Write an enzyme that holds these catalytic residues in place. Structure first.
Site, PDB file in Angstrom:
ATOM      1  N   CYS A 299       0.843  -1.189   0.000  1.00  0.00           N
ATOM      2  CA  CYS A 299       0.000   0.000   0.000  1.00  0.00           C
ATOM      3  C   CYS A 299       0.882   1.244   0.000  1.00  0.00           C
ATOM      4  CB  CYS A 299      -0.936  -0.010   1.208  1.00  0.00           C
ATOM      5  SG  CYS A 299      -2.092   1.373   1.290  1.00  0.00           S
TER       6      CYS A 299
ATOM      7  N   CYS B 216       0.938   3.681   2.981  1.00  0.00           N
ATOM      8  CA  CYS B 216       1.564   3.163   4.192  1.00  0.00           C
ATOM      9  C   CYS B 216       3.026   3.579   4.311  1.00  0.00           C
ATOM     10  CB  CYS B 216       1.444   1.640   4.243  1.00  0.00           C
ATOM     11  SG  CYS B 216      -0.242   1.035   4.507  1.00  0.00           S
TER      12      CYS B 216
END
Lengths: 64, 374, 90, 43, 114
Positions: free
Chosen positions: E37, E40
């Site tokens: 991700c 993140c």
């Protein structure tokens, strides 16, 4: 009309439309050698777009 | 009503927050995040062109030359103002945004339980993003807007789901088209049958639906298409192309899609990232061939928000080119604009930061495609 | 010599002079390159192969023989060389 | 060597029976000209 | 002899459960993340800075959703990045946040609500 604009330098086609002719018919890929045939699909080039420049922009503005 | 026609985006305004979460089998180092960019250029298939919150689509739509309004609720705190100031900076209309002075933006009160030896949480108070009421809807926006856009994240909130169907009623009463951009959140990936029941009512109300390849296969049969991709002929290939062992770009037949088709559906788009855009209409179907290049900029590539740019590009052309619904050649040419927007969006870190303008998207489209495909 | 080596290739290495069905461009390449590099083609085979580089000439040649196009397309897939002695099963 | 370029767009006209078929060093078919051939371009 | 480069610890679901059931005195911040991700990456740097600011006045931990997918779903994680702020007082309910919230916003939650 023409031949008066040409004499004076006023805007006019470079070639007189009345004295303008087509180019008949040319080889249609069946009477042609392999190296002179048009590709069936258009080929990507990286030169496929006209290069932008100052002259193009000013000419369009003067045309309006 | 000014031109271009207004579009309305309904849901929660969030910063980043990728909703589509599944399990990937290729994790990087848990601490060294400098390695994590290698998953941006070899992504999980569900993350090839990730979607996001509806505010991403509204921002991306405006940058592509359209006009958009966001309908939702934020808290009266400082973070709520930052989200509104973000959308006002991007010239997104915020008259449809309501303030809840008694709530904290993007904060959910939950209680932790220890049922059957496992830790679980239950919602005590929903955040202001998921608490817009029907009496708080801006009817001037719903009257003017020609496309009403929402995601499936609103189906995870009891309050928003009731509010959503009142917004749809008003939009249809005023002639607006309903755009359902699925973008399934983490809970809705648990089981096919529960998800199909949850989304069926909103699926039937939609005139335009965008789903990813992974979402479509999950909704129909995930194992059948996985087996289909892994099949290899034992002795010889059925045709010369099958010998090249190329990537699978299977185009689903309209009979496979039939369980999901209804009367009011005008256009179904299935996105395989930016590589393929499968489109389905009542009269015809086909696929638009696209591409991607994140390896051209390995240190700034970020796929987050590229799904929103594709959707925004679709809505930009749908409003200004109504003949896309009935002309297949016109539809394919306009969808290549959406492909180009998705490609550019993957070249920048951050979804909002990297959303492309209309002229940049048009330039890339003419550079990538041969002139006959423009 | 070039009689035992050919027999050796057949028996030991499984060589056979399998027919090569060539396109007009490939047929012209093998007939013309035997003459030189940039020279006037003189052999009747290379001269004819030069003419066959245009499918329009082939269609005119086919009509003069009275056969159809598909029959000509099938005549190029014909086994060349000599035939084996016909079978006599008793 | 010298390359002759077309001064205008148009259609090439000449008698192919006055020239000799050949293969160039680039693998292309062409004609060898041993006379003062007159080639016409109709623009 | 060499100080470690990362302060935020990665915990299993079983380890996190014992930490929550056990007695705590400082606020507990739990981060759900995944290495695939993109956001993140930005969240990981903010939480490392938050760990430096709150040396022993808070406990910052992280959970990978690739390893604890079922646990994340039961915790009502709807997407990434997601943060849980758990108070040391067992009566108070936890606060779940979504998205790349500012560092100052995290401090206000810890100081005023934790």
């Amino acid at each position: 009309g023409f031949e008066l604009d040409k004499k004076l330098g006023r805007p006019h086609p470079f070639i007189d439309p009345t004295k303008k002719k087509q180019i008949e018919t040319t080889l249609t890929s069946d009477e042609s050698w392999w190296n002179w045939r048009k590709p069936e699909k258009e080929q990507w080039s990286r030169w496929q777009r006209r290069r932008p420049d100052v002259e193009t922009v000013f000419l369009k503005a003067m045309a309006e | 009503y000014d031109d271009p026609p207004l579009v309305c985006c309904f849901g929660a305004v969030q910063k980043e927050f990728v909703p589509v979460v599944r399990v990937h089998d290729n994790p990087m180092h848990p601490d060294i995040y400098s390695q994590w960019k290698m998953l941006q250029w070899d992504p999980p298939e569900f993350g090839r062109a990730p979607g996001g919150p509806p505010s991403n689509v509204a921002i991306s739509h405006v940058r592509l030359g359209g006009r958009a309004a966001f309908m939702g609720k934020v808290g009266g705190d400082d973070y709520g103002e930052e989200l509104v100031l973000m959308m006002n900076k991007e010239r997104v209309q915020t008259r449809g945004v309501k303030f809840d002075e008694g709530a904290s933006t993007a904060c959910t009160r939950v209680k932790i339980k220890f049922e059957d030896g496992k830790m679980k949480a239950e919602t005590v108070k929903e955040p202001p993003e998921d608490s817009l009421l029907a009496s708080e809807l801006n009817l001037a926006v719903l009257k003017e807007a020609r496309i009403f856009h929402f995601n499936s994240e609103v189906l995870t909130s009891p309050t928003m789901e009731s509010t959503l169907f009142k917004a749809i009623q008003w939009s249809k009463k005023f002639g607006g088209l309903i755009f359902f951009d699925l973008n399934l959140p983490l809970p809705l990936w648990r089981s096919r049958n529960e998800t199909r029941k949850l989304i069926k009512k909103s699926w039937d109300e939609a005139n335009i639906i965008e789903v990813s390849q992974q979402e479509l296969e999950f909704l129909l049969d995930e194992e059948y298409y996985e087996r289909r991709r892994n099949y290899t002929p034992q002795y010889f290939a059925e045709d010369f192309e099958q010998t090249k062992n190329r990537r699978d770009y299977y185009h689903y037949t309209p009979e496979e899609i039939k369980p999901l088709w209804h009367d009011d559906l005008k256009l179904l788009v299935v996105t395989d990232g930016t590589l393929r855009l499968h489109y389905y209409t009542p009269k015809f179907d086909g696929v638009v061939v696209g591409t991607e290049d994140v390896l051209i900029t390995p240190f700034t590539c970020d796929r987050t928000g590229s799904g929103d740019a594709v959707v925004a590009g679709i809505m930009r052309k749908l409003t200004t080119c109504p003949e896309m619904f009935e002309d297949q050649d016109v539809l394919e040419r306009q969808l290549r604009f959406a492909v180009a927007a998705g490609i550019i969006s993957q070249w920048t870190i951050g979804a909002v930061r990297g959303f492309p303008t209309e002229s940049a998207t048009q330039n890339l489209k003419e550079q990538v495609y041969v002139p006959s495909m423009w | 010599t070039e009689d035992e080596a050919r027999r050796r290739n057949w028996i030991e290495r499984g060589w056979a002079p399998w027919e090569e069905i060539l396109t007009p461009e490939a047929d012209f390449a093998r007939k013309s390159l035997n003459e030189g590099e940039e020279v006037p083609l003189q052999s009747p085979e290379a001269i004819e192969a030069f003419k066959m580089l245009r499918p329009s000439y082939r269609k005119k040649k086919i009509k003069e023989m009275g056969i159809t196009e598909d029959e000509w397309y099938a005549k190029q897939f014909e086994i060349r060389g000599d035939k084996p002695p016909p079978l006599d099963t008793s | 060597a010298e390359h002759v370029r077309a001064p205008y767009n148009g259609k090439i006209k000449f008698n192919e029976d006055l020239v000799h078929p050949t293969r160039t060093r680039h693998g292309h078919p062409a004609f060898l000209c041993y006379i003062d051939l007159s080639v016409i371009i109709e623009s | 002899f060499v100080r470690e480069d990362y302060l935020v610890r990665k915990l299993s679901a079983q380890e996190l459960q014992d930490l929550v059931k056990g007695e705590r005195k400082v606020p507990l911040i739990v981060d759900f993340y995944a290495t695939w991700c993109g956001p993140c990456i930005l969240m990981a740097q903010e939480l490392e800075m938050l760990a430096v600011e709150y040396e022993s006045n808070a406990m910052i931990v992280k959970v990978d959703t690739d390893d604890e997918y079922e646990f994340a779903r039961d915790m009502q994680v709807r997407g990434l990045p997601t943060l849980f702020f758990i108070s040391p007082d067992p009566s108070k309910d936890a606060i779940r946040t979504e998205g790349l919230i500012p560092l100052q916003m995290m401090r206000d939650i810890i100081d005023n609500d934790m």
